[PDB]
Design a protein around this ligand. Structure first.
Ligand SMILES: O=C(CN1CCCC1)Nc1ccc(F)cc1
Lengths: 412, 412
């Protein structure tokens, strides 16, 4: 048997806001967080825009001196994590610290730090490399620094599954609790890949929208004029908690995490199969994990990256899994507004999926002006749709054909 | 209810050999894999040696067409994975491909690739960044590429827990099988951090031995004259398999994986606590997980990095866990010979722990000329020690205070 897992705390940095409620307010108003990237010369680049975190003050969380030791992706992960733990009301004690762990991931990790240290290395040789280069750049330092700051002695790890990281982090954290290896986990992801290497790297793959004249219209999942994803920064963190532990201290419970699916496409390094066979297996795995019939799903927060092949693969996958119910559920891509936070995408979209359940509203797919061939599902074009949502799925599909699906249900 | 997990296949690139048997021959003869680094100019660096993989031919495993797209850590991870899968005799089919997954991790991933593309960006601009920069550099692409080439549709993910990565990867892969999420997992890790940023970055932290004039004597775990770890390259992969699945196909079983522990130190970003409190908590979690009396432990493959603080912390942890039995078990650090493979350290050491069980021999801690204050256990100084080994433990500890322990025992 298995213990039940609930969500008692959430935290976020996104292109829409410096916390969950500001981010969610933008989501429900169909606001874009996409803009030309500032304080960085992108003249030589084919993409000049993305989703930046605007006005982040790390000194709300850390001393300037401790913040100087950490890449921006670690700062963003710690910000989301501290928010989530504060939002949970959890009190860490000598009696429970061994039962409280962390799994905060990243898809690409410390590119900005690597970039700045390469500069030192190439210009001035190796002796000018920061002593904090390694610990301040490696992906497991959000889990590390959080555990040290809060005295958490539970399972301490980090996932890195590219664009699936945040979904895998939350799912495997839920497993740790379900199987009695922890009572509480802080889980999610963070990303800051808006440097030359990130914009240049995805740019060299021709993976990015180049709609420089209209950045807010660039991310247009399932629209016939989409031309690739929009690179975005930020972080999401959830406090996952065993139900009886949450009830005992009188925690406010947002929702229950009832299912987690994983699958590998085993198809291509960067492209999904056109029929979405991998995403279909993964969703079926998640629904079997939750003991739910496909008919019980009301809302899907799609991966919905605004790539030609990715968006059409997800329609095919949903039709395959849900058959005569595929049109009854609502499915939207919040990436139409946030852009693609890569390893944090699954973390912020899990939060949006939980809030869709709290507020009984499907977030919109903005910019869906002309649905493409076969994109005839309820994709919540343009504006939020209030509706009954008992069960919400959040899907992530990443490089290496790695898939994750989370199943949340209303808790009462 | 929880299923049993056995080791049916193993694969390796190390500084001592291009497979498991050649590496193991080196381990049992007390041979050093450490040498001045030849693949770049280190005259400006404070450390100019490490454990390189010698004579690796990627065309033994991959088309030169596919190989050119991939960082060395991915090439090394794939080589070790391919070796492990062949060694297992497992046939991948439509009937079992959804039940076979992969969890190959890395501490740092494609730092060489990122450095080389950073050089291109800075000297020549963004249009010279490789189209393969992202899929060729990010940590989950061992798992990704392995799944694509072999058609593995099971759980597909990657851990990154710095120097604990290989141990966590194997333990969590075993949990996957234990809990029924897969029947087979390929799990381990790979690392190639021997670039300017890697040697420069660890150099800036003063974490590396600077014994440039005697590289084979540099790695001296528990010796009073130790002055930091030696940076080494390679990969370990194990095929983990549910017991009844292995029995049903006539698999050769090397050993049983009975125990896995994790803990966080919650102490310091980089330094372990002097008293080994976190390591002790981890080992106790693993021994309880395996249903063992601590007196059943015969051999410990120590983390044993040859750092002042790390080595003495491990003695303190072992004395705390084992009390008087600490003087009866054998404990050795194969890092004395291989150096520190970082994310791959736990993967190769798990393999050395399994072969310790197969061959009933404790590998030596070479260079242990003058054991330091309190290092008065059987550390198997200088020469391999044939002895009864029913239960073997492999420990890893990393940046962020992240600890892992695996417990293996003989299978009949
Ligand atoms: O293991 C080797 C070759 N060995 C390594 C050192 C001496 C000879 N090759 C290999 C194994 C599996 C596979 F799928 C493809 C190639």
């Amino acid at each position: 048997s298995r213990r039940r897992v609930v969500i008692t705390g959430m935290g976020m940095l996104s292109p829409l806001g410096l916390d969950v409620p500001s981010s969610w307010e933008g989501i429900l108003a169909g606001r874009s967080g996409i803009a030309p990237i500032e304080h960085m010369d992108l003249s030589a680049y084919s993409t000049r825009f993305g989703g930046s975190v605007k006005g982040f003050n790390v000194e709300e969380y850390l001393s300037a001196k401790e913040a100087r030791k950490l890449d921006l992706f670690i700062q963003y992960g710690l910000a989301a994590s501290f928010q989530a733990v504060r939002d949970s009301g959890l009190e860490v004690t000598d009696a429970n610290r061994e039962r409280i762990g962390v799994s905060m991931g990243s898809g690409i990790g410390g590119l900005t730090n690597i970039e700045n240290n390469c500069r030192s290395l190439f210009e001035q040789g190796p002796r000018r490399i920061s002593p904090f280069f390694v610990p301040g750049s490696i992906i497991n330092m959000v889990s590390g620094f959080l555990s040290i700051h809060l005295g958490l002695q539970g399972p301490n790890y980090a996932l890195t599954t590219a664009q699936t990281t945040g979904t895998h982090s939350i799912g495997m954290a839920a497993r740790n609790i379900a199987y009695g290896e922890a009572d509480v986990m802080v889980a999610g992801g963070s990303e800051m890949a808006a440097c030359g290497l990130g914009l240049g790297g995805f740019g060299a793959a021709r993976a990015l929208s180049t709609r420089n004249d209209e950045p807010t219209r660039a991310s247009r999942p399932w629209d016939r004029d989409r031309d690739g994803f929009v690179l975005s920064d930020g972080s999401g963190a959830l406090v996952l908690e065993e139900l009886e532990h949450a009830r005992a201290r009188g925690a406010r419970i947002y929702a229950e995490l009832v299912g987690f699916g994983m699958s590998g496409d085993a198809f291509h390094m960067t492209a999904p199969p056109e029929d979405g066979a991998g995403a279909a297996r993964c969703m079926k795995n998640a629904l079997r994990d939750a003991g739910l019939d496909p008919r019980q799903v009301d809302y899907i927060n799609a991966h919905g990256t605004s790539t030609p092949a990715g968006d059409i693969a997800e329609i095919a996958a949903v039709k395959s899994v849900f058959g005569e119910h595929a049109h009854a559920l609502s499915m939207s891509s919040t990436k139409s507004m946030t852009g693609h936070l890569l390893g944090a995408a699954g973390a912020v979209e899990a939060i949006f999926s939980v809030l869709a359940l709290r507020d009984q509203v499907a977030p919109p797919t903005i910019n869906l002006d002309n649905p493409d061939e076969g994109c005839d599902l309820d994709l919540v074009a343009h504006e939020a749709k209030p509706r009954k949502i008992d069960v919400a799925l959040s899907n992530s599909f990443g490089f290496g054909g790695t898939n994750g699906t989370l199943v949340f249900r209303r808790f009462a």
